[PDB]
Amino acid sequence: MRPYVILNAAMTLDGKIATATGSSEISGEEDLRRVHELRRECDAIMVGINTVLADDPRLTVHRVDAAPGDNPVRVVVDSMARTPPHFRVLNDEAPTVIGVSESAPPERVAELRKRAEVVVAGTRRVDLHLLLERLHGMGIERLMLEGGSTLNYSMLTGGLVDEVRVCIAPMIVGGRDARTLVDGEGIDEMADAIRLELKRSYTLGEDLIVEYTVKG
Known binding residues: 51, 55, 79-82, 126, 148-151
Residues within window 39-98 making contact with ligand NAP, judged by CB under 6 A: 47-51, 54-55, 77-80
Residue 133, exposed/middle/buried by CB under 10 A (0-12, 13-18, 19+)? middle
Phi and psi at residue 203, to the nearest 5°: -85, 150
Contact 46, 144 (CB under 8 A): yes
Residue 37 binds to Cl ion (criterion: CB under 5 A): no
What is the Cα 144 distance to its own chain's centre?
7
Positions that interact with its own copies (CB under 8 A): 11-16, 19-21, 23-26, 149, 152-153, 156-157, 164, 166, 168, 170-178, 180-198, 201, 203, 208, 210, 212
- We find the least distance from the C-beta atom of residue 94 to Cl ion, in angstroms, to be 11
Residue 204, exposed/middle/buried by CB under 10 A (0-12, 13-18, 19+)? middle
Residue 58 binds to Cl ion (criterion: CB under 5 A): yes
The size of the interface with ligand NAP (CB under 6 A), counted in residues, is 30
Is the Cβ of residue 14 or residue 56 nearer to its own copies in the bound state?
Answer: 14
Residue 57 binds to Cl ion (criterion: CB under 5 A): yes
Is the Cβ of residue 110 or residue 171 nearer to its own copies in the bound state?
Answer: 171
Contact 48, 149 (CB under 8 A): no
Pairing of strands 163-169, 4-12: parallel
Q: Which long-range contacts (CB under 8 A, 24 or more apart) does 136-139 make?
A: 136/1, 136/2, 136/3, 138/73, 138/97, 139/43
Residues within window 2-31 making contact with ligand NAP, judged by CB under 6 A: 9-10, 17-18, 22, 24, 26
Q: Taking the alpha carbons of 32, 33, 39, 42 in that order, is the dihedral positive or negative?
A: negative
Instruction: Report what 48 binds from Cl ion, its own copies, ligand NAP, none; CB cut-off 5-8 Å by kind.
Output: ligand NAP
Residue 180 binds to ligand NAP (criterion: CB under 6 A): no
| Rounded Cα–Cα distance for residues 99 and 107 (Å) | 15
Q: Which of 5, 179, 182, 209 binds ligand NAP (CB under 6 A)?
A: 179
Q: Contact residues for ligand NAP (CB under 6 A)?
A: 9-10, 17-18, 22, 24, 26, 47-51, 54-55, 77-80, 125-126, 128, 146-151, 154, 179, 183
Q: Contact residues for Cl ion (CB under 5 A)?
A: 57-59
